[PDB]
Each structure stands twice: as C-alpha cells, then as structure tokens.
Design a protein around this nucleic acid. Sequence first.
RNA 1: GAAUCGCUAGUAAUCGCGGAUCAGCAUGCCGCGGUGAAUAUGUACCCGGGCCCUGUACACACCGCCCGUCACACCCUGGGAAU
Length: 84
Amino acid sequence: RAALLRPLAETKTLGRWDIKCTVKGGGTTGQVGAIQLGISRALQNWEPDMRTSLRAAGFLTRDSRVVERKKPGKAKARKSFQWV
RNA sequence: GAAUCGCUAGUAAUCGCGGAUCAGCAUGCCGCGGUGAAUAUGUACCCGGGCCCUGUACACACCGCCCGUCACACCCUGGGAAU
C-alpha cells in the first residue's frame, strides 16, 4: 500500500483523482508492480508536463528483469552440479 | 574436521506448480511460475588460458628425457703368488 501510494506522494495531496483498476496473473509483488506502472502510464492526464516530475525519480519504466528461464544440463539458470 | 564445490541480479537461496517415460512409479531428469538479496577490490596472490621474448640434451614433446650404486645373466679383458 505504501508502495502503491508513493506514486502520488508528490505534486498531489491525494485529493484530486480517482482510480478504478484491475489486475491478474503472477504474484504478490508482480501485481503490485503492474498496478504501479499502470498508474504511471495513465498519469498522462496532463500529458506533456507530468513526465517532467516523474522521470526524475524513475516512475515511468518497467522492471525488465523478467524471469530467466531454465537452460538444460544445469539445475537452474546459473546453478550447476559438482564435478570431481 | 580438513578440505572442496556453486554462483555477479530476477541470479543465489527457498516456495511450490507442470510434463517426461509408464497399468502399477521419481529423493531423478525437463520445463513453469511465486518470493527474493550478498557482492563488485579487479589481476597482488595460488589458479587457468593466451602472447612473445629468451634457454632446452624434450618430439610419446616435462606424467619428458635421464645419471649412479646394488641384486641378475652371458661375454670379453687386466693384475696376480708360484709355472
């Protein structure tokens, strides 16, 4: 909740807007991030003037750390068995 | 225990979920997603690889070649009393 309210604890006393939302897929941190960045998209009600206040702190871009798959042979994407 | 192994950001660690072969079956394997950091001093060190510059009796290429005593067999030869 604190995480999803930071996106508007700047240049907004919270007393100006309404958000009707929805989210699916993934997990507890995935969904919260998804909602956060959706708000970050739709903060374009004032289009050419809010990305000013936003990009500075970094409230615009996705976390492109999408999970790294499992390769063969190993037991994970970087873990490896033990040779002697 | 000595040691020794695995890893530099969605990774480590754990969380389960899903296949596989198959009537009967996974602590195994393959895949998928949840959550999720430590640390970047960098080539000093052991380590590993390359360069090129020197030295080599090595070329099966140093786990290489290789010397010497002793134990062993055959062969040849010297000294040697006395002849």
